RNA sequence: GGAAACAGCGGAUGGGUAUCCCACCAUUCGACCCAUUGGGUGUAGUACUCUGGUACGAAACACGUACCUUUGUACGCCUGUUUCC
């Protein structure tokens, strides 16, 4: 019922501005106190910023005070944080948080939005190659053998990989995306599968990746010989 | 001013059943004013204790929160299946706010060692320049495990990249992928690749192998 | 007794005064309170203030309200002292 859609998240150059909002919806946070909290990949939360209800103040961290603004449009029931002159460090996904009512939950976020990613770099949008990870020409060893796609040299994160338009997903395994010396990510999906049907099936591994707009379908099969 | 939250451990290996439990230290006095957060890997957090000891709603009676003093502790009396993940804790006595570093919590099981599979890098690739070996560890337990690649039996070094899933969600075993970059004029220099795998679960190390152009 | 005025913590000592107490001053010497170049200290009374808090209002601050506390003003009350009548 109580939700919070954040937008506006993307890749900036270092220097550069950013608005991230945070749209409400089953409450007005002209009642609550608004949060804004992120998370470094593969680190822990890191609160940015709040502000207050009915006075309008604001609060921030350390690092960004100064730099970012909170504020909230009770017209539009949305909240933002505009940041300005952006560093790398800042690279992270933002949540807006719902602080929850005084007798409800003390101070607890009680409510969290999906995320935005937010990637500060002075590298330029790259989409994918994407190749296939070819089935064992070879003999069964154990009954089984395994195929995938690898998706190389794309910036910024994220990709997605499907197979077979999401059909199939039993036994996908779609690792994480690892930062090449080039400043390219790379990442591979690998399923496993029966070696007997190889050439008799069909194998679509769907890659995604909404930062270039790009979409790409390769078929999996074993070669010549 | 700055108030610090330290947790600990920072990691925990557990089995279903155990009571767990994750501490929190605040460097100064924060009152009550303490939340605990659940947050599983890709997802936002989602609140489980606040005000130090009071169970929000939703929230299984399996977990509590307590405090004493500045030491602030969230239990689990019995660990389930469910409650992999990452927990923090945060004070919100004063501004700014301070999360502890979050303790991950995973679950224990058997060993498992891994299937091992190479793979030849696509004609396709080879077109643009770049040639990409890629060696997959599937389904084994626990998650340490070790990589080497050989070229005509010499040993690589700092040409190879590694990466591992998150615990599964039903076998809770790793897989992992090794890449093996090299131009494509090294990767005709030579004819033997081969992917050697050193684990818990393996007797004695196994090797996947091709030689290059093998149709 | 009746007004009217002024005042209100404890020594000690001294002075006078009393000449016993008692009053009356000086001096030092304390004690307690408070918002400490200082100020307050009969009152379990009131009402305004101010100091700092507690709580709630969809509310960490601000805002509103309630209560508590402190400061200081009146007012009422008790106790004196003086002058009268």
């Known amino acids: 019922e109580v939700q919070l859609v954040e937008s506006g998240g993307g890749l900036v150059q270092p220097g550069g501005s950013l608005r991230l909002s945070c749209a409400a919806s089953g409450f007005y946070i002209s009642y609550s106190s608004i949060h804004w909290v992120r998370q470094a990949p593969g680190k822990g939360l890191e609160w940015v910023a709040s502000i207050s209800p009915y006075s309008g103040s604001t609060y921030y961290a350390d690092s960004v005070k100064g730099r970012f603004t909170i504020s909230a449009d009770t017209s539009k029931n949305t909240a933002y944080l505009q940041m300005n002159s952006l560093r790398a460090e800042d690279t992270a996904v933002y949540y807006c948080?719902?602080?929850?009512?005084?007798?409800?939950?003390?101070?607890?976020?009680?409510?969290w939005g999906q995320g935005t990613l937010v990637t500060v770099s002075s590298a330029s949008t790259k989409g994918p190659s994407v190749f296939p990870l070819a089935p064992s020409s070879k003999s069964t060893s154990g009954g089984t053998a395994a195929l995938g796609c690898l998706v190389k040299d794309y910036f910024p994160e994220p990709v997605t990989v499907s197979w077979n338009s999401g059909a199939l997903t039993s036994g996908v395994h779609t690792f994480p995306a690892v930062l090449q010396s080039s400043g390219l990510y790379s990442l591979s999906s690998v399923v496993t599968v029966p070696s007997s049907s190889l050439g008799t099936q069909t194998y679509i591994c769907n890659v995604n990746h909404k930062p270039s707009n790009t979409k790409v379908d390769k078929k999996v099969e074993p070669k010549s010989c | 001013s700055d108030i610090q939250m330290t947790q600990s451990p920072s990691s925990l290996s557990a089995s279903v059943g155990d009571r767990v439990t994750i501490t929190c230290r605040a460097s100064?006095?924060?009152?009550?004013?303490v939340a605990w957060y659940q947050q599983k890997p890709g997802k936002a957090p989602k609140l489980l204790i606040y005000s130090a000891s009071s169970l929000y709603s939703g929230v299984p009676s399996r977990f509590s929160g307590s405090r004493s003093g500045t030491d602030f502790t969230l239990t689990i009396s019995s660990l389930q299946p469910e409650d992999f993940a990452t927990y923090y804790c945060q004070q919100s006595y004063s501004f700014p706010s301070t999360f502890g570093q979050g303790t991950k919590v995973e679950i224990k099981r058997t060993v498992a060692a891994p299937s091992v599979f190479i793979f030849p890098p696509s004609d396709e690739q080879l077109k643009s320049g770049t040639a990409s070996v890629v060696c997959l560890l599937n389904n084994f337990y626990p998650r340490e495990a070790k990589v080497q690649w050989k070229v005509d039996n010499a040993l690589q070094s700092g040409n190879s990249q590694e990466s591992v899933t998150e615990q599964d969600s039903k076998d809770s075993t790793y897989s992992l992928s090794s890449t093996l970059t090299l131009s494509k004029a090294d990767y005709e220099k030579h004819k033997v690749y081969a992917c050697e795998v050193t684990h818990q679960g393996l007797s004695s190390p196994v090797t996947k192998s091709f030689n290059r152009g093998e149709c």
């Open positions: 100064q006095s924060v009152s009550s004013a």
């Open positions: 948080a719902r602080q929850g009512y005084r007798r409800r939950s003390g101070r607890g976020f009680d409510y």
